[PDB]
Known about the structure:
2 copies of one chain form a homodimer.
Chain A: E1 3-7, H1 14-18, E2 22-26, H2 35-41, E3 46-49, H3 57-65, E4 69-72, H4 77-87, H5 89-98, E5 103-106, H6 108-112, E6 144-146, H7 158-168, E7 174-176, E8 182-186, E9 189-193
Parallel strand pairs in A: 1-5, 2-3, 2-4, 4-5, 6-7
Antiparallel strand pairs in A: 1-8, 8-9
Helix pairs in contact in A: 3-5
Amino acid sequence: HMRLLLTSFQHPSMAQFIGGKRVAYIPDAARSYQKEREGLEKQGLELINLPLSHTDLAAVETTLNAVDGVYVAGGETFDLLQVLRSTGSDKVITRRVRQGLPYIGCSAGSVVAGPTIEAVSLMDSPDIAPDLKDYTGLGLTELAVIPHASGSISQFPIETIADTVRTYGERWPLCLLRDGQALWIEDGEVRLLN
Amino acid sequence: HMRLLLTSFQHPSMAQFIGGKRVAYIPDAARSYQKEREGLEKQGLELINLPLSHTDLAAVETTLNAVDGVYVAGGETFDLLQVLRSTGSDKVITRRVRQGLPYIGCSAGSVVAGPTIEAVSLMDSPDIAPDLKDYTGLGLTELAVIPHASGSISQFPIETIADTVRTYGERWPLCLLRDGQALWIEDGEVRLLN
């Protein structure tokens, strides 16, 4: 019973989606540089910090076993995938989610769950992960989320969003998500939330 | 109990979505110029042609009362909205759909169901309806469908799809639908189909 909530920038249904109070918080995407945590904490969720960069694989496994859900924070998508691949936590996380551990993605966290992270090359710099060549995602979903699709963030203007569709729209099943939208994927069905 | 199936170019679930054999077929979008009918008929559906341009509202009412669903074919979106507004069938169709008549949109048919048709100005020419100024849609959904989003159709290349996002992505909640995808909207929920 895999359950996913792939948000562009979070959603009010996060705590209800977890169905519990304790959530492992993975912050490695932003490791190269608070607001996100307060979003979860304001809904009554307790955050168990899980920095994959500083956590041995055995401790990752047990931590994901003692929490009600996992949240992958936004940041640099390529850095996040690089950490996931190098640590080997990508397999641990995927296995736990496929076994029923609810997964909340935010921005980069939603992108890595898809088939690839190459489609966000114009949004997040691949240069932050010089030795990362294989951009294959976790594959939890077939949808390639493009977050912040409304261009409201100065960091990701609408011209960049349009460039992403032009460069990658043909090959990849882009799913543009605006801030406030999310994909609730449960029981093998994809619900588009507003 | 409003039920909608807004397809980019049809879907295998159309007949199951109807839950019946008889479907009123509205072809006015393509009136300015066959394969689409075969898609419905190949699924066992019986098409009752409903050309809004040549049908008085009294005949529209009885026709939609004797069928299990309505299908709005692709074509020129601006011409389709012009016909819907001028004939007054836009209110007749909206009322029955809101009363539970299942609605299948294809391309232009899915676009008119949204809040506006302005966002497809780069895909379909507004010039076909010179006197049409108010691009307000039927309002059946808050999502502004952008069909054929993969750029596979030569008439609608990916550069045009990206231009649509650049021009309208900020103001409107664009929902890019690729051929084979659909939005199944039932019981107040939006399901993204593949």
